Amino acid sequence: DGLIDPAEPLDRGFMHLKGRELKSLNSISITGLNDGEKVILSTLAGLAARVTGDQVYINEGGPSSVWLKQMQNKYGIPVNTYNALAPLVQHYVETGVIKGYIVYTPYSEGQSHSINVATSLCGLLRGIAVPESLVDKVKAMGVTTELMDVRSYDEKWLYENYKDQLDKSLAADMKPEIFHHLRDYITMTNAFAFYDYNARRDWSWRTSILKDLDKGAYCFGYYDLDEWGMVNNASQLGVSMLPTDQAANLATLSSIYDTTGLKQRPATKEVVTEENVHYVTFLVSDGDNIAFNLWGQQGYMDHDLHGQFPLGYTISPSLYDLAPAALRWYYENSKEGDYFVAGPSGSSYIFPSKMSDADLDDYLAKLNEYVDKSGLNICNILDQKIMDNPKVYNKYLAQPNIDAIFYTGYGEKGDGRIKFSDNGKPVIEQRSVLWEGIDGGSNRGEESTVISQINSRSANPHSADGYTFVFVHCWTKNQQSIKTVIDGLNDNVRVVPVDQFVQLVKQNLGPK
């Protein structure tokens, strides 16, 4: 074969399972494929990444093309292009990767979850997932053996029959009408994929699944159907959420082991305080979401205004393991006034206030080492009541590699408080927000409001009143929205990079 036995465990980075070391890419455009073809393609990608370095890339253009070219150019990976699904599938029949198909019923028919059953079985049985309507099409591509018929089954059947064969370091909350995102990584890892959303938001079944995972486990997948409830549910159990159901190509992206260029420039430790100014910094939201990191964030950063003002970005430390080519690109594309912060609330989306003391201690010891590798020393916490939770903020800031917190409260206005850990590091609460229609149609997050707010505050860097941390909602407010604010600010207002803001706060307001 030149294939690795599918029973051999995957390698892991410090945090995440990674595919077999990448040697060649077989790139195919998403254009003109139907839903079933998308499922075939993503489960195939997961097949390949478990057993070979000859891997699949789903090229969606835009940011997807950027990551492909980055791998070609920085890591010397050859790219073969395929103009159609049939020859790509045939290639993987010939190389021995595809052993057959697993037939399922789409969600469009009777709300079947069988797509998830098929996806989780693909890596075990060495099959592609195929809806009944495409069985003859795949047979014509050379995939002639039916490995299993799962049309009548749900994820409870899957778990009852395959729990001990499925990975226990992650599971995936997987919507049955997401076709080409995430399923590759699920098939690669033999993760259990399930959809437990119900109108009751009854959390018993998900709890039962999550409690069966190993200590330090992840839950990949969606959050948007019940965000606070899902994150609370996982965090209380010591489980980390990684928003990933809108991420493509993670199996393949994870397969680069070269970690050159993955350490951010250091946060500055030297800045001269200017008297009689008000200091402002801007930080973009949503960086915990790997799908944002792999799509929207690339376009966001490459706005035509990039570099006209300094800007902070949140990003996921987990990109170090899951998509090093993309993390590398961010750091290489950064301008001097750009600076990256770990997204909510560390290496994954947790509410640290909901974890047990022991689980949070474990989480933070890992975080501390992991951000040393990526240089993501400043962290954004998204949680509730943190400014009144010195236990939690002191535990973060006790870590030698975690140097400051930017706190954005979940459903909290943000009062701009600045507090210090016992060891003298700042915890900086949101003070303005740029967000269209925040709180169900208010004007609190409009450019005109943020301008008025900043311009009303005192130009005194020796007081917390002299500082505004502006949090920027990535989906509604882009670099032009930020520039609009900046262009309205008074002459005594100074817009600074995030790391400078932290040092100014520390030296002007922290212990002497």
Short mmCIF file of C-alpha atoms in Angstrom, two decimals:
data_model
loop_
_atom_site.label_atom_id
_atom_site.label_comp_id
_atom_site.label_asym_id
_atom_site.label_seq_id
_atom_site.Cartn_x
_atom_site.Cartn_y
_atom_site.Cartn_z
CA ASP A 1 0.00 0.00 0.00
CA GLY A 2 2.47 2.65 1.23
CA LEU A 3 -0.41 3.18 3.62
CA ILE A 4 -0.41 3.25 7.38
CA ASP A 5 -2.65 0.65 9.04
CA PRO A 6 -5.94 2.43 9.98
CA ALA A 7 -5.73 0.75 13.41
CA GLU A 8 -2.49 2.61 14.27
CA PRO A 9 -3.22 5.58 16.55
CA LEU A 10 -2.89 9.08 15.15
CA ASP A 11 -0.11 11.34 16.32
CA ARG A 12 -1.02 14.27 18.55
CA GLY A 13 0.41 17.71 18.82
CA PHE A 14 0.54 19.18 22.30
CA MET A 15 -3.29 19.46 22.15
CA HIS A 16 -4.89 17.93 19.04
CA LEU A 17 -4.87 14.83 16.87
CA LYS A 18 -3.08 15.43 13.56
CA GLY A 19 -3.19 13.57 10.26
CA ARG A 20 -0.34 11.63 8.70
CA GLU A 21 2.44 13.95 7.67
CA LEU A 22 1.44 15.79 4.55
CA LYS A 23 3.29 14.89 1.36
CA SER A 24 0.95 15.84 -1.53
CA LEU A 25 -2.35 17.66 -2.02
CA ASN A 26 -5.19 16.71 -4.38
CA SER A 27 -7.19 19.87 -4.72
CA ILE A 28 -10.74 20.07 -6.07
CA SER A 29 -13.16 22.91 -6.38
CA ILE A 30 -16.36 22.93 -4.46
CA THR A 31 -18.22 24.43 -7.43
CA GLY A 32 -20.90 22.29 -9.06
CA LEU A 33 -21.04 19.54 -6.43
CA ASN A 34 -24.35 18.57 -4.76
CA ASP A 35 -24.86 17.88 -1.05
CA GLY A 36 -24.12 14.13 -1.32
CA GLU A 37 -20.98 14.72 -3.35
CA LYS A 38 -19.81 17.10 -0.63
CA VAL A 39 -20.24 14.38 2.00
CA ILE A 40 -18.38 11.88 -0.18
CA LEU A 41 -15.56 14.37 -0.59
CA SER A 42 -15.21 15.32 3.09
CA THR A 43 -15.38 11.73 4.37
CA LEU A 44 -12.82 10.77 1.70
CA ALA A 45 -10.52 13.53 2.94
CA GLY A 46 -10.80 12.01 6.42
CA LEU A 47 -10.06 8.56 5.07
CA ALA A 48 -6.89 9.71 3.42
CA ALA A 49 -5.56 11.78 6.32
CA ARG A 50 -5.61 8.72 8.61
CA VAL A 51 -3.50 6.49 6.36
CA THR A 52 -1.42 8.60 3.96
CA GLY A 53 0.32 11.90 3.32
CA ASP A 54 -1.45 12.03 -0.09
CA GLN A 55 -4.37 14.14 1.03
CA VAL A 56 -7.46 15.97 -0.24
CA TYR A 57 -8.04 19.73 -0.31
CA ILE A 58 -11.45 21.26 -0.85
CA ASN A 59 -10.71 24.52 -2.57
CA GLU A 60 -13.50 27.04 -1.99
CA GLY A 61 -11.48 29.96 -3.30
CA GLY A 62 -10.88 33.09 -1.26
CA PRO A 63 -9.26 32.29 2.08
CA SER A 64 -9.22 28.56 1.17
CA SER A 65 -6.93 29.36 -1.79
CA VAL A 66 -4.64 31.35 0.51
CA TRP A 67 -4.04 28.36 2.78
CA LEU A 68 -3.44 26.06 -0.18
CA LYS A 69 -0.85 28.39 -1.69
CA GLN A 70 0.76 28.86 1.71
CA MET A 71 1.27 25.09 2.01
CA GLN A 72 2.66 24.91 -1.52
CA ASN A 73 5.03 27.79 -1.08
CA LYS A 74 6.20 27.52 2.57
CA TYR A 75 6.27 23.77 2.93
CA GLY A 76 7.00 22.74 -0.63
CA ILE A 77 3.92 20.53 -0.90
CA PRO A 78 3.04 19.53 -4.50
CA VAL A 79 -0.51 20.19 -5.60
CA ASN A 80 -2.43 18.04 -8.06
CA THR A 81 -5.65 19.55 -9.29
CA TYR A 82 -8.74 17.53 -10.06
CA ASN A 83 -11.48 19.02 -12.24
CA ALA A 84 -14.19 16.58 -11.11
CA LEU A 85 -15.07 14.27 -8.23
CA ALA A 86 -15.02 11.00 -10.23
CA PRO A 87 -11.26 10.96 -11.02
CA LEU A 88 -10.42 12.01 -7.46
CA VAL A 89 -12.45 9.13 -6.03
CA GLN A 90 -10.90 6.76 -8.58
CA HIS A 91 -7.43 7.87 -7.50
CA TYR A 92 -8.20 6.84 -3.93
CA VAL A 93 -9.69 3.53 -5.05
CA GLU A 94 -6.45 2.81 -6.90
CA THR A 95 -4.18 3.82 -4.00
CA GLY A 96 -6.10 1.51 -1.65
CA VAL A 97 -7.62 4.12 0.62
CA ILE A 98 -11.30 3.57 -0.22
CA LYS A 99 -12.58 0.09 0.64
CA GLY A 100 -16.27 0.74 -0.10
CA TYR A 101 -19.24 2.92 0.82
CA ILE A 102 -21.63 3.37 3.74
CA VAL A 103 -25.13 4.24 2.63
CA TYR A 104 -27.23 6.74 4.59
CA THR A 105 -30.51 8.64 4.28
CA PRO A 106 -30.27 12.45 4.06
CA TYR A 107 -31.88 14.68 6.72
CA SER A 108 -34.15 16.06 3.99
CA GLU A 109 -35.91 12.64 4.26
CA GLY A 110 -37.66 12.21 7.61
CA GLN A 111 -35.09 14.22 9.59
CA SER A 112 -32.69 11.26 9.55
CA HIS A 113 -29.47 11.69 11.52
CA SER A 114 -27.96 8.71 9.66
CA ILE A 115 -25.40 10.99 7.96
CA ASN A 116 -23.73 11.26 11.40
CA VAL A 117 -23.78 7.49 11.89
CA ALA A 118 -22.15 7.04 8.46
CA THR A 119 -19.54 9.76 9.14
CA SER A 120 -18.36 8.24 12.44
CA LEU A 121 -18.22 4.76 10.86
CA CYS A 122 -16.29 5.81 7.77
CA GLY A 123 -12.89 5.75 9.42
CA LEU A 124 -13.59 2.48 11.17
CA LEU A 125 -14.88 0.58 8.09
CA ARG A 126 -12.70 2.51 5.58
CA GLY A 127 -15.61 3.78 3.54
CA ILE A 128 -17.01 6.93 2.05
CA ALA A 129 -20.46 8.12 3.22
CA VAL A 130 -22.94 8.10 0.37
CA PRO A 131 -26.62 8.96 0.31
CA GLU A 132 -28.79 6.32 -1.35
CA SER A 133 -29.30 8.55 -4.44
CA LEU A 134 -25.57 8.51 -5.31
CA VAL A 135 -24.82 4.82 -4.81
CA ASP A 136 -24.83 4.11 -8.54
CA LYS A 137 -22.69 7.17 -9.23
CA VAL A 138 -20.00 6.05 -6.75
CA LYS A 139 -20.08 2.50 -8.10
CA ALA A 140 -19.21 4.02 -11.48
CA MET A 141 -16.16 5.70 -9.78
CA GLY A 142 -14.96 2.25 -8.71
CA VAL A 143 -16.46 2.15 -5.17
CA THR A 144 -18.45 -1.01 -5.54
CA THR A 145 -18.63 -2.68 -2.09
CA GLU A 146 -21.39 -1.76 0.37
CA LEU A 147 -19.66 -1.82 3.76
CA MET A 148 -22.79 -1.03 5.74
CA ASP A 149 -26.34 0.28 5.31
CA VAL A 150 -27.06 2.80 8.09
CA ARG A 151 -30.20 4.38 6.60
CA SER A 152 -32.42 3.35 9.53
CA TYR A 153 -30.04 4.21 12.38
CA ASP A 154 -29.48 7.19 14.66
CA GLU A 155 -26.55 8.20 16.83
CA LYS A 156 -27.87 6.30 19.87
CA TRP A 157 -27.63 3.10 17.82
CA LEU A 158 -24.08 4.16 16.85
CA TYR A 159 -23.03 4.72 20.44
CA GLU A 160 -24.62 1.49 21.73
CA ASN A 161 -22.77 -0.49 19.06
CA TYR A 162 -19.49 1.39 18.65
CA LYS A 163 -18.73 3.40 21.79
CA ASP A 164 -15.51 1.49 22.55
CA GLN A 165 -14.23 1.82 18.98
CA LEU A 166 -14.74 5.61 18.85
CA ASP A 167 -12.16 8.11 20.07
CA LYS A 168 -12.55 9.42 23.64
CA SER A 169 -10.43 12.59 23.38
CA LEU A 170 -13.10 14.41 21.36
CA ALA A 171 -16.69 14.26 20.19
CA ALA A 172 -18.50 16.49 17.68
CA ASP A 173 -21.85 18.29 17.92
CA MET A 174 -22.58 17.80 14.25
CA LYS A 175 -25.61 19.23 12.47
CA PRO A 176 -27.05 16.72 9.98
CA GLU A 177 -27.33 19.28 7.17
CA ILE A 178 -23.72 20.39 7.31
CA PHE A 179 -22.14 18.38 4.48
CA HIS A 180 -18.54 19.27 3.75
CA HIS A 181 -17.26 20.98 6.89
CA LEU A 182 -15.76 19.10 9.88
CA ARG A 183 -16.78 15.62 8.72
CA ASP A 184 -13.26 15.04 7.43
CA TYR A 185 -11.76 15.56 10.88
CA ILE A 186 -14.48 13.36 12.43
CA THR A 187 -13.73 10.52 9.99
CA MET A 188 -9.98 10.97 10.46
CA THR A 189 -10.21 10.62 14.25
CA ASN A 190 -13.12 8.18 14.59
CA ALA A 191 -14.93 10.77 16.68
CA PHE A 192 -18.56 10.27 17.70
CA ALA A 193 -20.71 12.76 15.75
CA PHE A 194 -24.15 13.55 17.17
CA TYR A 195 -26.97 16.06 17.03
CA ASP A 196 -28.70 16.37 20.43
CA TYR A 197 -30.41 19.73 19.90
CA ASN A 198 -34.06 19.55 20.88
CA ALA A 199 -36.78 22.18 21.48
CA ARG A 200 -36.44 21.49 25.23
CA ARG A 201 -32.68 22.11 25.29
CA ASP A 202 -32.69 19.03 27.56
CA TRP A 203 -29.02 18.38 28.23
CA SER A 204 -29.07 14.80 29.57
CA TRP A 205 -27.90 12.97 26.43
CA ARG A 206 -25.05 15.37 25.58
CA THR A 207 -23.91 15.28 29.21
CA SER A 208 -23.90 11.48 29.05
CA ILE A 209 -21.68 11.59 25.93
CA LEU A 210 -19.35 14.28 27.23
CA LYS A 211 -18.93 12.64 30.65
CA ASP A 212 -17.67 9.48 28.90
CA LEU A 213 -14.76 11.43 27.30
CA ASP A 214 -11.26 11.40 28.70
CA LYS A 215 -10.06 14.16 30.98
CA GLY A 216 -9.06 17.21 28.92
CA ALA A 217 -11.37 16.27 26.04
CA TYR A 218 -12.80 18.52 23.36
CA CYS A 219 -16.14 18.93 21.82
CA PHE A 220 -15.84 20.07 18.20
CA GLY A 221 -18.86 21.28 16.21
CA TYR A 222 -21.60 23.92 16.54
CA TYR A 223 -22.49 26.36 19.32
CA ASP A 224 -25.11 28.65 17.79
CA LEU A 225 -28.29 26.72 18.60
CA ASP A 226 -27.79 27.35 22.32
CA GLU A 227 -24.45 29.02 22.95
CA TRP A 228 -24.47 29.86 26.62
CA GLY A 229 -26.16 26.55 27.47
CA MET A 230 -23.72 24.46 25.41
CA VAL A 231 -20.62 26.17 26.75
CA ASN A 232 -21.92 25.99 30.35
CA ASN A 233 -22.75 22.29 29.82
CA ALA A 234 -19.31 21.43 28.46
CA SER A 235 -17.32 23.65 30.83
CA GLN A 236 -18.96 22.28 33.95
CA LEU A 237 -17.83 18.82 32.81
CA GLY A 238 -14.27 20.03 32.17
CA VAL A 239 -14.75 19.79 28.38
CA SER A 240 -13.39 22.35 25.98
CA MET A 241 -15.46 23.51 22.98
CA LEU A 242 -13.79 24.24 19.71
CA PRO A 243 -16.16 25.88 17.22
CA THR A 244 -15.38 24.06 14.03
CA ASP A 245 -18.52 23.02 12.16
CA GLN A 246 -17.92 25.70 9.56
CA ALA A 247 -14.26 24.78 9.09
CA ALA A 248 -13.12 22.94 6.00
CA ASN A 249 -9.99 20.85 5.49
CA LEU A 250 -8.98 20.40 9.11
CA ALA A 251 -7.87 16.80 8.59
CA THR A 252 -5.46 17.92 5.87
CA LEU A 253 -4.47 21.24 7.49
CA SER A 254 -3.62 19.35 10.69
CA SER A 255 -1.12 17.18 8.78
CA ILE A 256 1.72 19.70 8.68
CA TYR A 257 4.19 19.02 11.55
CA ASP A 258 6.68 21.80 10.75
CA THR A 259 6.08 24.53 13.35
CA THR A 260 8.46 27.12 11.89
CA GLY A 261 7.07 30.62 12.07
CA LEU A 262 4.36 29.87 14.62
CA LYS A 263 5.58 32.13 17.44
CA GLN A 264 4.22 35.66 17.51
CA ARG A 265 6.49 38.64 18.03
CA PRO A 266 6.75 39.50 21.73
CA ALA A 267 4.37 41.90 23.42
CA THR A 268 6.21 45.18 24.04
CA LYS A 269 7.53 45.88 27.50
CA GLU A 270 8.61 49.46 26.74
CA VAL A 271 6.38 52.40 25.93
CA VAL A 272 6.66 56.01 26.96
CA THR A 273 3.55 57.39 28.66
CA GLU A 274 2.35 60.58 26.97
CA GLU A 275 0.76 63.02 29.42
CA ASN A 276 -2.70 64.45 28.84
CA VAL A 277 -4.00 61.84 26.42
CA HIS A 278 -6.77 59.26 26.43
CA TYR A 279 -5.59 55.80 25.26
CA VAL A 280 -7.71 53.52 23.07
CA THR A 281 -7.23 50.01 21.77
CA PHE A 282 -9.46 47.88 19.51
CA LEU A 283 -9.82 44.07 19.69
CA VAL A 284 -11.77 41.97 17.11
CA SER A 285 -14.13 39.24 18.40
CA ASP A 286 -14.81 35.62 17.61
CA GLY A 287 -11.23 34.38 17.34
CA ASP A 288 -12.00 31.21 19.24
CA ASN A 289 -13.98 30.06 16.20
CA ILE A 290 -11.66 28.08 13.94
CA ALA A 291 -14.06 28.67 11.01
CA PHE A 292 -13.62 32.40 11.47
CA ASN A 293 -9.83 31.95 11.64
CA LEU A 294 -9.94 29.90 8.39
CA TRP A 295 -12.35 32.13 6.46
CA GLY A 296 -13.83 35.42 7.61
CA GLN A 297 -10.81 36.53 9.60
CA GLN A 298 -8.52 36.34 6.57
CA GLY A 299 -10.72 38.70 4.62
CA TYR A 300 -11.17 40.84 7.71
CA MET A 301 -7.45 41.30 8.17
CA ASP A 302 -6.88 41.88 4.41
CA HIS A 303 -9.31 44.79 4.27
CA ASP A 304 -7.93 47.54 2.04
CA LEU A 305 -7.34 49.66 5.20
CA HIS A 306 -5.02 47.09 6.78
CA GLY A 307 -2.11 48.89 8.43
CA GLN A 308 -3.67 52.37 8.59
CA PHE A 309 -4.23 51.91 12.34
CA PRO A 310 -3.21 49.34 14.94
CA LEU A 311 -5.63 46.49 15.65
CA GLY A 312 -5.87 43.55 17.98
CA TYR A 313 -7.27 40.22 16.82
CA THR A 314 -8.45 37.26 18.77
CA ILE A 315 -7.37 33.89 17.34
CA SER A 316 -7.40 30.28 18.50
CA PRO A 317 -4.21 28.86 19.98
CA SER A 318 -5.48 25.52 18.66
CA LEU A 319 -4.65 26.72 15.11
CA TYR A 320 -1.05 25.80 16.07
CA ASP A 321 -1.98 22.13 15.87
CA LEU A 322 -5.00 22.14 13.53
CA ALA A 323 -3.93 24.63 10.83
CA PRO A 324 -0.30 25.71 11.27
CA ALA A 325 -0.11 27.01 7.69
CA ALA A 326 -2.88 29.50 8.52
CA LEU A 327 -1.33 30.61 11.85
CA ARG A 328 1.92 31.11 10.05
CA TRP A 329 0.19 33.24 7.44
CA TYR A 330 -1.36 35.46 10.10
CA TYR A 331 1.97 36.15 11.73
CA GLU A 332 3.74 36.70 8.38
CA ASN A 333 0.89 39.04 7.19
CA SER A 334 0.87 41.04 10.39
CA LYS A 335 1.83 44.68 10.38
CA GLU A 336 3.72 46.25 13.26
CA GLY A 337 0.59 47.54 14.99
CA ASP A 338 -1.30 44.26 14.66
CA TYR A 339 -1.30 41.95 17.64
CA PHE A 340 -2.99 38.59 18.26
CA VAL A 341 -4.69 37.57 21.55
CA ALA A 342 -5.90 34.11 22.52
CA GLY A 343 -9.62 33.99 21.90
CA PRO A 344 -12.35 33.06 24.37
CA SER A 345 -11.16 31.77 26.83
CA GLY A 346 -7.77 30.25 26.16
CA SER A 347 -7.02 27.46 23.68
CA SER A 348 -10.71 26.73 23.28
CA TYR A 349 -14.07 28.21 24.24
CA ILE A 350 -14.77 27.62 27.93
CA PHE A 351 -16.38 29.56 30.74
CA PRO A 352 -13.63 29.19 33.32
CA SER A 353 -15.98 30.26 36.10
CA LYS A 354 -17.98 27.05 35.53
CA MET A 355 -15.13 24.52 35.69
CA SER A 356 -14.12 22.72 38.84
CA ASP A 357 -10.97 24.04 40.50
CA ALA A 358 -8.99 20.94 39.47
CA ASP A 359 -10.24 21.00 35.88
CA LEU A 360 -9.46 24.72 35.51
CA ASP A 361 -5.98 24.11 37.05
CA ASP A 362 -5.34 21.38 34.46
CA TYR A 363 -6.69 23.54 31.63
CA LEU A 364 -4.49 26.50 32.61
CA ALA A 365 -1.29 24.42 33.00
CA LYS A 366 -1.78 23.22 29.43
CA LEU A 367 -2.71 26.69 28.22
CA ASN A 368 0.42 28.14 29.77
CA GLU A 369 2.66 25.79 27.82
CA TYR A 370 0.67 26.06 24.61
CA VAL A 371 0.73 29.86 24.39
CA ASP A 372 4.48 29.81 24.89
CA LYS A 373 4.65 28.04 21.54
CA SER A 374 2.35 30.43 19.67
CA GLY A 375 3.26 33.64 21.55
CA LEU A 376 -0.43 34.18 22.42
CA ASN A 377 0.47 35.51 25.89
CA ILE A 378 -2.51 37.84 26.19
CA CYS A 379 -5.89 36.17 26.60
CA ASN A 380 -9.53 37.17 26.03
CA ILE A 381 -11.94 35.70 28.55
CA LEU A 382 -15.65 35.53 27.60
CA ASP A 383 -17.62 34.55 30.72
CA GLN A 384 -19.74 36.29 33.39
CA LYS A 385 -18.91 38.25 36.57
CA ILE A 386 -15.19 37.90 36.06
CA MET A 387 -14.33 41.32 37.44
CA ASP A 388 -15.74 39.98 40.73
CA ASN A 389 -13.92 36.62 40.38
CA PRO A 390 -10.35 37.10 41.54
CA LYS A 391 -10.05 33.34 42.04
CA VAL A 392 -10.38 32.83 38.27
CA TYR A 393 -8.41 35.84 37.03
CA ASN A 394 -5.58 35.18 39.51
CA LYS A 395 -5.37 31.55 38.34
CA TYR A 396 -4.96 32.67 34.72
CA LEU A 397 -2.44 35.36 35.57
CA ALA A 398 -0.45 33.12 37.95
CA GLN A 399 0.70 31.29 34.82
CA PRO A 400 4.10 32.60 33.79
CA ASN A 401 3.19 32.85 30.10
CA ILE A 402 -0.19 34.54 30.50
CA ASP A 403 0.45 38.22 30.86
CA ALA A 404 -2.93 40.01 30.73
CA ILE A 405 -6.66 39.44 30.30
CA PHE A 406 -9.02 41.34 28.10
CA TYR A 407 -12.45 40.61 29.57
CA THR A 408 -15.62 40.71 27.51
CA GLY A 409 -18.64 39.74 29.59
CA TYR A 410 -21.27 37.44 28.08
CA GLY A 411 -24.33 39.64 27.93
CA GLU A 412 -22.60 42.32 30.00
CA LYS A 413 -22.38 45.94 29.00
CA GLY A 414 -18.74 46.44 30.06
CA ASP A 415 -17.87 49.17 32.53
CA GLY A 416 -14.13 49.56 31.72
CA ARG A 417 -12.89 48.38 35.10
CA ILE A 418 -9.18 47.60 35.35
CA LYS A 419 -8.05 45.28 38.14
CA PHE A 420 -4.73 43.61 38.88
CA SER A 421 -3.89 40.09 39.84
CA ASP A 422 -1.91 39.51 43.00
CA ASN A 423 1.24 39.28 40.88
CA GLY A 424 0.63 42.64 39.20
CA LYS A 425 -0.86 41.75 35.78
CA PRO A 426 -3.88 43.57 34.38
CA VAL A 427 -7.47 42.43 33.86
CA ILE A 428 -9.01 44.92 31.42
CA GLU A 429 -12.82 45.02 31.05
CA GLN A 430 -14.53 46.14 27.83
CA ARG A 431 -15.47 49.84 27.98
CA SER A 432 -17.00 50.44 24.55
CA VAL A 433 -18.22 48.12 21.85
CA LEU A 434 -18.57 48.41 18.10
CA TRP A 435 -21.49 46.08 17.21
CA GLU A 436 -24.49 46.77 15.02
CA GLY A 437 -27.83 46.58 16.81
CA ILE A 438 -26.33 45.13 19.97
CA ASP A 439 -28.81 43.89 22.62
CA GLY A 440 -31.67 43.52 20.17
CA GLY A 441 -31.46 46.90 18.42
CA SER A 442 -29.76 49.40 20.64
CA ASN A 443 -27.45 52.12 19.44
CA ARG A 444 -24.76 51.43 22.08
CA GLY A 445 -22.46 49.75 19.55
CA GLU A 446 -22.74 52.32 16.75
CA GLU A 447 -19.73 54.31 15.55
CA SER A 448 -21.29 57.60 16.66
CA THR A 449 -21.84 56.27 20.17
CA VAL A 450 -18.26 54.95 20.47
CA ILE A 451 -16.85 58.29 19.23
CA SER A 452 -18.95 60.23 21.73
CA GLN A 453 -18.00 57.86 24.55
CA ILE A 454 -14.26 58.00 23.93
CA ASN A 455 -14.28 61.78 23.42
CA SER A 456 -16.11 62.28 26.73
CA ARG A 457 -13.57 60.42 28.85
CA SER A 458 -10.62 61.96 30.64
CA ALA A 459 -7.22 62.39 29.03
CA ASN A 460 -5.45 61.07 32.13
CA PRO A 461 -3.21 58.02 31.74
CA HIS A 462 -2.68 57.87 35.51
CA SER A 463 -6.31 56.82 35.98
CA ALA A 464 -8.35 53.89 34.68
CA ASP A 465 -10.65 56.62 33.33
CA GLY A 466 -7.90 57.41 30.82
CA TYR A 467 -8.24 54.09 28.97
CA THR A 468 -10.82 52.66 26.55
CA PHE A 469 -10.74 49.03 25.46
CA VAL A 470 -13.10 48.84 22.46
CA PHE A 471 -14.35 45.35 21.57
CA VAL A 472 -15.23 44.98 17.88
CA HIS A 473 -17.92 42.55 16.68
CA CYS A 474 -16.38 40.95 13.63
CA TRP A 475 -19.62 40.09 11.85
CA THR A 476 -21.13 43.57 11.89
CA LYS A 477 -18.10 45.95 12.10
CA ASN A 478 -15.04 45.80 9.90
CA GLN A 479 -11.87 47.83 9.50
CA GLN A 480 -13.81 50.66 7.85
CA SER A 481 -16.12 50.83 10.87
CA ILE A 482 -13.08 51.11 13.12
CA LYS A 483 -11.51 53.80 10.90
CA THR A 484 -14.76 55.76 11.09
CA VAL A 485 -14.44 55.80 14.89
CA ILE A 486 -10.77 56.71 14.75
CA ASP A 487 -11.45 59.61 12.34
CA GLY A 488 -13.91 61.10 14.81
CA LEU A 489 -11.65 61.07 17.85
CA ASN A 490 -10.29 64.20 19.49
CA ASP A 491 -6.67 65.31 18.98
CA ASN A 492 -5.72 64.19 22.50
CA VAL A 493 -6.81 60.59 21.90
CA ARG A 494 -4.12 57.97 21.09
CA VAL A 495 -5.04 54.70 19.39
CA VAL A 496 -2.41 52.07 20.25
CA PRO A 497 -1.75 48.38 19.61
CA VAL A 498 -3.08 46.00 22.23
CA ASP A 499 0.31 45.13 23.64
CA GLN A 500 1.18 48.78 24.08
CA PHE A 501 -2.17 49.35 25.82
CA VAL A 502 -1.33 46.53 28.28
CA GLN A 503 2.10 47.95 29.07
CA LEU A 504 0.70 51.50 29.53
CA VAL A 505 -1.96 50.15 31.90
CA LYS A 506 0.59 48.09 33.81
CA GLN A 507 3.14 50.87 34.27
CA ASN A 508 0.64 53.66 35.00
CA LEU A 509 -1.95 51.80 37.11
CA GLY A 510 -0.31 48.61 38.46
CA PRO A 511 1.81 48.12 41.61
CA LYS A 512 4.82 50.48 41.81
#
